[PDB]
Amino acid sequence: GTSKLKYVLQDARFFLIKSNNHENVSLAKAKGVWSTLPVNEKKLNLAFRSARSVILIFSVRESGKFQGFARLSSESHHGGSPIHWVLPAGMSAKMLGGVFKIDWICRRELPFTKSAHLTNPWNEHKPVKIGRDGQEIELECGTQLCLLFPPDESIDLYQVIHKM
């Protein structure tokens, strides 16, 4: 059903995460971790204390899709393991240093064609697919966006609800 998902999303905050390649999203799905630039790490740390759930919605650049969504389970922490991210041009390992732990809520894809009816008030009402890495997505838009994803029957939200 969708009832536990709706409970998790209640009063949540949502952020668009853009990844330059698929390898880093695969690594995040396998290990339950995400790292971002210091400008966004600061925003996510602030949001984690402010909301019952902080949801990251992932999209690999140029894929035309979202690859799933996850809930922050921790603030960022350093010196836990060297995650073998695929660092793009200009990008380095010292900036991707703060590591957040995340719990995946949906590992299924959603094509942008399916979200064309959702606009984000916090990005000038552009389609929710549009935004820089870290763009906050307003509550109602983000909730409806997550509800569009195919259900991920491999995931039991019972343990997520207990983290809250």
Swiss-Prot record:
- Indicate the impact reported for residue 104 to D: Does not affect ability to influence alternative splice site selection
Q: What is the effect of changing residue 44 to E?
A: Does not affect ability to influence alternative splice site selection
Superkingdom: Eukaryota
Question: Which residues are recorded as binding RNA?
Answer: 18-20, 34-35, 85, 133
The consequence of residue 24 to D is: Abolished binding to N6-methyladenosine (m6A)-containing RNAs
Outcome (variant: residue 133 to K): Does not affect ability to influence alternative splice site selection
Q: What happens upon changing residue 95 to A? A: Reduced binding to N6-methyladenosine (m6A)-containing RNAs
Its PTM note reads: Tyrosine phosphorylated.
Instruction: Write down which residues bear the modification named Phosphoserine.
Output: 81, 92
Q: What is the effect of changing residue 85 to A?
A: Abolishes binding to N6-methyladenosine (m6A)-containing RNAs. Abolishes binding to m6A-containing mRNAs
Cellular location(s): Nucleus; Nucleus speckle
Please give the annotated consequence of changing residue 34 to D: Abolishes RNA-binding and ability to influence alternative splice site selection
Residues covered by the YTH domain = 12-149
Provide the leader sequence positions: none
Query: Any coiled-coil ranges, and where?
Result: none
Q: Fill in the domain comment.
A: The YTH domain mediates RNA-binding.
Subunit structure, interactors included: Interacts with SRSF1. Interacts with SRSF2. Interacts with SRSF3. Interacts with SRSF7. Interacts with SRSF10. Interacts with CPSF6. Interacts with KHDRBS1/SAM68. Interacts with TRA2B. Interacts with KHDRBS3. Interacts with EMD. Interacts with RBMX. Interacts with ZCCHC8.
Entry function: Regulator of alternative splicing that specifically recognizes and binds N6-methyladenosine (m6A)-containing RNAs. M6A is a modification present at internal sites of mRNAs and some non-coding RNAs and plays a role in the efficiency of mRNA splicing, processing and stability. Acts as a key regulator of exon-inclusion or exon-skipping during alternative splicing via interaction with mRNA splicing factors SRSF3 and SRSF10.
**Could you tell me what this protein is called?**
YTH domain-containing protein 1
The organism encoding this protein is Homo sapiens
